């Protein structure tokens, strides 16, 4: 019985073009624990992506937080791509500055 990861992509602080910030990719409710997370900028993989240690909640599902430093601009696109056994293919979630 596998559980499909839930994903949220968002900045640590309200986004302001030109100001250093932190982009988070919060992944929860998945099982098994093995998971592959990448953060992408304009379609290209971001090299420096930090990963928090993994933890699990009362319902046994695991969660983890990926994050990277970034300076948002009006036109740069960011996304988080997650590969997990529960999904036939990798799920890509785009950053929406308003969420």
């Amino acid at each position: 019985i596998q559980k499909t990861p839930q994903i949220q992509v968002y900045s640590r602080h309200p986004p302001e073009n030109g100001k250093p910030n932190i982009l988070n990719c919060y992944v929860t409710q998945f099982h098994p624990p093995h998971i592959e997370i990448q953060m992408l900028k304009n379609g290209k993989k971001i090299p420096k992506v930090e990963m928090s240690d993994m933890s699990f909640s009362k319902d046994w599902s695991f969660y983890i937080l990926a994050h990277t430093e970034f300076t948002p601009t009006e036109t740069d696109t960011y996304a988080c791509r997650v590969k997990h056994d529960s999904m036939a293919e990798p799920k890509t979630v785009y950053w929406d500055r308003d969420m």
């Binding site: 019985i1 596998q2 559980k3 839930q6 949220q8 968002y10 640590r12 602080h13 309200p14 932190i22 988070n24 919060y26 929860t28 099982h31 098994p32 624990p33 093995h34 928090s52 240690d53 993994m54 933890s55 699990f56 009362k58 046994w60 599902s61 937080l65 994050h67 308003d98 969420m99």
Partner: protein, 278 residues
């Protein structure tokens, strides 16, 4: 109020890739304070909260030895379960345990925990009476019978009512000043719209702690719950949390809606509305 000390433990087999990955995380009042991860040359329990640095070398040595003991015990359990379920030796499987005590203000045990899961599903758990077990399937009935004969429930009860409660008091003394940390949410409303006659008002709650919080939208009277979009509370990554609730409303009627933020750290619930900048 109530307090708790629980350990969340995981063992994941990795056939053909090495020894099982074993991780043990300790929590006080739902805050990580110690962690053991087998993924190292010389694995050891480590402080995850500054206030734990107070514990001396004998404490760390003892806990580390106990973790390595449990690690090897889970290694054996993984093999045992392959037999119980008649599964191949080539697949990866997971065993998880939540063990600990929740104590009330009077210092008495409110609830003891000792529950197991195999591959993300309940396996066996110690009942509230701390005397009997609940097996989730046929494989767990084997463990149940085994533990009933061994008086395992009595051993756990002694730990849960004694050691666990005692150490919890000790940890609370050292970290109380930190654990009581409270950051009230700072809120604001954003306005979003696409060329249409409707608009989205989004109520944001930021920099708060603990994570428990409630956001609601009101139209003059009554609470809008049937058509309010809400995201799961999420970590900002700096120790505080974030959350937002949004509603779609008629263009021009933004001033008829109010957002309310309920947090344990708020002397009084926050009330706010869309405020178009000057």
């Amino acid at each position: 109020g109530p307090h708790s000390l629980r350990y969340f433990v995981t063992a994941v087999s990795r056939p053909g890739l090495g020894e099982p990955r074993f991780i043990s995380v300790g929590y006080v009042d739902n805050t990580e304070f110690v962690r053991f991860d087998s993924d190292a040359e010389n694995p050891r329990y480590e402080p995850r909260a500054r206030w734990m640095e107070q514990e001396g070398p004998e404490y760390w040595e003892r806990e580390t030895q106990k973790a390595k003991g449990n690690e090897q015990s889970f290694r054996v359990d993984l093999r045992t379960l392959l037999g119980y379920y008649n599964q191949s030796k080539g697949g990866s499987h997971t065993i998880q345990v939540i063990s600990g005590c929740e104590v009330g203000s009077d210092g008495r045990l409110l609830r003891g925990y000792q529950q197991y899961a195999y591959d993300g599903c309940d396996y066996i758990a110690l009942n509230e009476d701390l005397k009997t077990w609940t097996a989730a399937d046929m494989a767990a009935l084997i463990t149940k019978h085994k533990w009933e004969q061994a008086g395992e429930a009595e051993r756990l009860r002694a730990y849960l009512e004694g050691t666990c409660v005692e150490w919890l008091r000790r940890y609370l003394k050292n970290g109380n000043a930190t654990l009581l940390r409270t950051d009230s949410p700072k809120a604001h409303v954003t306005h979003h719209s696409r060329p249409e006659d409707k608009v989205t008002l989004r109520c944001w709650a930021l920099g708060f702690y603990p994570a428990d919080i409630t956001l609601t939208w009101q139209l003059n009277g009554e609470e809008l719950i049937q058509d309010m979009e809400l995201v799961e509370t999420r970590p900002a990554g700096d120790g505080t949390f974030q959350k937002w609730a949004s509603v779609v409303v008629p263009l021009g009627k933004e001033q008829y809606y109010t957002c309310h933020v309920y947090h344990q750290g708020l002397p009084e619930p926050l009330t706010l509305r869309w405020e178009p900048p000057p």
